[PDB]
Assembly symmetry: D2
Homo-oligomer: 425 residues x 4
């Protein structure tokens, strides 16, 4: 029904193995990736990637999140970067085949015992300019996150807080930090200086695993393709690092000086895209999903229950995609936490949410703009078909394919409770 | 609550190993769940009175077996009439009415190589009188099943064929027999004579396991509580046998002499009910579900996909029940095959499907008698409410409990594709 | 199949069809059940020991000789019936029947003698009659005591005190027959040498439909502890009057073995039944089948995960030896034991290889029947001047009795477990040997 | 305090996800570094004084790249390495043997090139222990190298370098006839897409681990350390992941041969390896290796599993094995024990060659045989306990597993013994 050639692609013989050792032995270099690249790419916006024309090329190469490093440059400079990014993103708003929303992240300068005076001004700037994510520098304890949450005035409560663990104190207080944070960033640059360089990989692997268990996005950062600042190709250690960060379970991967000041910014985005696609295919979903399932506590939350039921169903039929109607992005995040092999096409009316779901691995946002139907059930079905139309368009779906549709019983966020098995018409 | 997690061997079912599970079995941990394993009671002079049968229904008789090896067609027609009169004596309360299937156990081929002439007449009688299940005696190969299917004719298309494996040939050709049969019966009486008595348990355990893997109902039969033919209580070996048949994975357990001619017909049914309730609580669902999940093949069938997703969701929230609408009973059978701990409350308008689902373990049928609503979605919701009301009335459900609702996208059999997480109001 | 492709070519495809070997190689328990073949015959010797109650139907020296041949390992004397004089004659008839095969020490089968106490009855502890019966057992050299109605750890202490200083070697198997005993099980097992699941009284004290949970829990806890457990009462009840048992009785016996019972017992089936030798033969047949169908893959891995880390050389050598035995499909594990402890420590890991235990102690040789898979050999030769030579002569005695009784054939691999110095407690050496 | 060190809370976890969550940066490694370090000998690491520092930093195998330099040049490198290694021979309980590996030029456009035959003959004449065969494509290429060593080069180990697509495809036939494999990522990253190299590395390492043969991870492991004193976050990650994958050896190419920091790179690889080995999830690893290993009727193979199982039960400090060829130690290594495999051998070539196996710590026994064989065996077991105690592997009170045979000569290993230290 699917074919012998289908079961050779995207490391399907390796993922069917009864053991992890057998899985490794079945990894085929001739087994090509079919699924879209799920791990998002954070690109640092600097002089080498600041023109509306250069930004248009980086969006095409695969940039999902645009990072503004507030350690360098004025508020006036970063406001122009925000405008150039928004102008480059809206240049494809006519065509829904090239239109992809891009999140804007503010990376704070850093602390001093707590939130610095400059950081309060920078955070206030981010709120006034509508940033989606905040990369809080040098988070040490839960009170540091609370300080950043407080500095995000009456307005900025929707902004996501990704705590950067860059020192020994934060590594030790990790559990309390993650509890109050929206996600974590393994800031390996400063971490490699505060703690022994040979212990950084344990912190990365521990934090990624704990984030995966918690269901919160984790970013792997610093020197991923460092040689790409001056060279067109990365070293064997750099491609290995990127691939292993994806394998560890990182939701996002990041380019710092490779995109901000490097001679090769578009090339680095293209390279990260290529390695991520390969690595995701080699993920051992059999053990991953069973462990995530066993480790996850029992839940009486319909969204959480529908999320595991949907991912279970998606694996059973090899669903092409899981279409989820979300408003805040929560439902899509809860699907992503179980690491499905099917792309989570998330249809939202919230432009902020559509940008913010790039933080979650495997979530492909669609901003649906249409005017609402008088009947709610009809409005839900127009958003579902919109999911299918775009899926068909961007290569995810073909007629005959199976998809899992996740919706709620009534309007408003938090009522997700339905999972539907749908055949593409 | 604390008290909830002490009942129905919940500490034992949470164990990381099967050895730990056994060590955590508490005799003071009472069963809460309803008895899922159905009870087949052989009809005889000890069980023909309408008043007596009413007591047997109350004790838990689900299937009434008519042994065609004894008695005339006239005799069995009076049996059918007494079973039906006794079952219909509780039709006045449709939320607490228990349907009872009627199974015809053929005389057999005897000396003959295939379907005997008497068997053709008996099968035609079964069809004319509306039997639900046929227990084909001495099935030796797949052609024997085909012969019985042919003898039922076009009017007996709906009747289920449970092949009785009673000899060595039938044990060897098991795979071909099970392939063409609706289910199997481990006929231990004749099997204990055809094969060495000390090898019968291996045939029982093999057949039960293979049936469980296939998703087809399996019946454990003969001498389960033999001493109760004359004595008020069974031996320590008999209670152990019944409990182990349930633990092995038998969908149904059966009483022959115990209910046909014995002095304790009602008490035998009460005893089997009691042991089954205890055994089901002690089932190690942690390993059972994970093995059944792993062993099941990939499917592109929406009913099959929704079934595994629903059972997975039911386990995540400790669902009180899974309410499924079904025409043929297939949807309920597909939920049953994954051995959920939640009761599969199956609502159906088909009286034959409601009787036949007793073959599947954990399926509690409800016959919906109301005439259809003009709007199909309203008619579906009225049947879901009928299920919640009967569930609440019979003690399956309490307000605050979570329930998984399984429905389809259009009327008619084959279209189940929706799973819904619902909280009892 | 790559993890058996080489050994299937060597040992053969016919070897890997017998004793439910395709079923035991399955990756899941569900797959194991699907691979159970009725045409797969048992090759190994019957490991689960058979306790037979000695009564009028099984008292003559000639009848006892037939029951030993049929497979009786332990002879139970029920002190709830009969006088001390009566039980002394039973002891004499059993000993006479056992010693009638002493002429061939490579094919002589030792039989343990167990005393089943009358019980406390109305009383709160050890009855006055029980004290007299226990002193009788000590005076007559019984190997095991089946303490009736044990309810707390103080009850077993009372029985150990009543045996006195002369009855220190006797094993105490506590019978759990009531709700109190089931609840205080952990404290009872801690101070007892083993347990007996007395299902007759247990089926009366607790609901009959709850007895199987108590049996399965107690057996599992005993298996975890490494102590012998006995399944008792109504196992083949219909054979008291009938030549063949019911489908429920064969099922019960097979399931008790599967649960992990070290011993199975015949009460009124042999004491007063019309077919006492037939019941022993039947229990032997069902046990051999059931042991083959044991899912050793998960059983051994669970027993290893559940067992705590040990710094005891005997305990360490025991797990290392059982692991080695499984790697090469060892025909047997030959262990030199004084008290039986080393053989008990091998048994707790439930090896598929037969634990052939060579001991000079006649009481230990009788008492190791309590452990499943231990086949005792009583070494009667006088010691060699060199200890290493004396050890090698006992190892050869084991290989010769193993070859003679069919356990071993030339080409088979065996695991030899010995110590570094004489005396009990010094087991620390494991040796892989090929049968010559 | 013992159960907090060397990631013991993480290794006790019931799941691999839980294992990752329990990784503690404050949990220090106690055990010795098992993964061997191959250092490429070049101009930056040629002096006897510089080599002595690299031996102290952790070098176990010295690689001679025959793609550059004359036979005269490589003979001087061999002499300088041997002089630096023998400078610590005065203390035989704390002397570290170093293997010498010859990395062939390759076939290039061509089977076995004419230069390769001359280079292989040179290695035989100079007593090399290992040969890193460049660009192996099929089983006949390995046979060609074995033929070129001749009758004098039987003892030399052949590590086939998989550097192209053909070699990756015919991997099963190559590994079957080779002594081990080297994942040559430099050329492999050019022949196949760079983003597919990690799949080849992970596949080859897993297949080698299954086979029980040594595997080497090679090229650009700490590349930035050629010009900088510290590596990038990607490079430390790469090294740690190669160890985690199951590589028996890790290699420094231009980082030791021509880099400004050759001793620093050896020190860095040692540090990352020690940390990574502690974070290995032995619970699942040993159970998977046990399940995956076929049944064997070979006493050495059987005693090897039995000994590793016993070592895990008592948390044995070390497994002392008496070996002649190194085979018994290799068979213990394949089950990846947490206990150090202290291997006592009289053969100097075997003692150098066991660096190819992860977790095998060679000891060269330099005393002449006792008249009684049992006494000679006990003296070698004591030599192992004394060197263990001396080098910090053992403390009084620790438990050790001793693996010996029933008679002298190779292939008769069949005994396992539980021993308590002093
Ligand atoms: O390998 S085992 O025999 C075993 C038995 C049962 C199960 C678990 N069931 C199970 C798991 C998956 C299935 O597909 C299935 O049909 C049954 S169970 O809990 O359902 C069960 C419980 C009780 C039984 O009598 C029985 O036969 C089975 C696993 C391993 C074993 C292993 C370890 C022990 O300590 C020990 O006493 C026995
Ligand atoms: O992921 P979220 O934010 O909780 O949103 C889930 C909600 O979105 C829906 O799927 C769509 O409903 P809306 O029409 O209100 O967007 C709801 O039925 C459900 O309550
Ligand atoms: O299990 P079956 O036989 O497929 O019946 C399930 C069917 O019942 C329904 O749930 C309800 O349909 P009906 O209105 O015909 O009763 C269908 O949507 C579904 O196809
Ligand atoms: O099982 P036990 O009672 O500990 O006996 C094991 C003992 O038996 C031996 O193997 C042989 O002992 P003996 O020389 O005393 O007969 C000892 O080396 C070891 O200490
Ligand atoms: O690892 P190898 O080469 O098989 O060597 C193992 C051999 O070493 C020993 O342990 C000691 O052997 P030697 O007396 O030859 O040194 C033997 O008993 C065994 O045969
Ligand atoms: O700021 C950062 O991201 C760092 O230091 O790694
Ligand atoms: O007919 C039966 O039920 C049998 O043979 O078991
Ligand atoms: O005494 C017994 O054996 C019993 O009660 O079962
Ligand atoms: O020769 C090598 O090692 C390479 O090319 O990687
Ligand atoms: K910054
Ligand atoms: K019949
Ligand atoms: K008694
Ligand atoms: K070269
Ligand atoms: Mg920083
Ligand atoms: Mg019959
Ligand atoms: Mg009693
Ligand atoms: Mg090369």
């Amino acid at each position: 029904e699917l074919g012998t050639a289908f079961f050779q692609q995207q490391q399907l013989p390796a993922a069917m193995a009864d053991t992890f050792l057998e899985h490794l032995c079945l990894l085929d270099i001739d087994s090509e990736p079919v699924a879209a690249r799920s791990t998002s790419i954070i690109a640092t916006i600097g002089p080498a990637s600041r023109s509306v024309e250069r930004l248009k090329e980086m969006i095409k190469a695969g940039m999902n999140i645009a990072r503004l490093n507030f350690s360098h440059g004025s508020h006036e400079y970063h406001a122009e970067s925000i405008a150039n990014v928004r102008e480059a993103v809206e240049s494809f708003a006519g065509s829904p085949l090239s239109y992809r929303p891009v999140a804007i992240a503010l990376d704070t300068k850093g602390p001093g015992p707590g939130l610095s005076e400059q950081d309060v001004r920078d955070l206030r700037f981010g709120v006034e300019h509508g940033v989606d994510i905040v990369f809080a520098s040098f988070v040490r304890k839960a009170s540091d996150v609370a300080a950043v949450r407080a500095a995000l005035g009456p307005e900025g409560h929707g902004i996501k807080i990704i705590s950067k663990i860059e020192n020994h104190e934060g590594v030790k207080r990790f559990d309390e930090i993650l509890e109050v944070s929206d996600g974590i960033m393994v800031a390996r640059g400063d971490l490699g200086i505060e703690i022994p360089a040979e212990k950084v990989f344990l912190a990365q692997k521990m934090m990624i695993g704990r984030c995966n268990l918690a269901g919160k996005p984790v970013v792997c950062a610093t020197q991923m393709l460092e040689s790409m600042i001056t060279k067109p190709r990365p070293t064997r250690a750099e491609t290995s690092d990127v691939a292993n960060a994806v394998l560890d379970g990182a939701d996002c991967i990041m380019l710092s000086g490779e995109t901000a000041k490097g001679n090769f910014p578009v090339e680095a985005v293209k390279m990260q895209h290529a390695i991520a696609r390969e690595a995701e295919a080699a993920v051992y979903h059999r053990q991953l999903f069973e462990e995530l399932r066993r480790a996850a506590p029992l839940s009486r939350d319909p969204t959480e229950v529908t999320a595991i039921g949907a991912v279970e169903a998606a694996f059973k039929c090899c669903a092409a995609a899981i279409i989820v109607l979300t408003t805040t992005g929560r439902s899509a995040q809860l699907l992503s936490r179980y690491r499905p092999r099917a792309a989570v096409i998330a249809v939202t009316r919230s432009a902020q949410a559509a940008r913010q779901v790039h933080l979650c691995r495997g979530v492909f946002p669609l901003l649906y703009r249409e005017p609402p139907e008088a009947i709610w059930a009809d409005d839900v079905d127009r958003r579902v078909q919109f999911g299918i139309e775009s899926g068909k368009l961007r290569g995810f779906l073909r007629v005959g394919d199976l998809v899992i549709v996740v919706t709620g019983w009534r309007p408003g966020s938090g009522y997700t409770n339905i999972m539907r098995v749908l055949s593409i018409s």
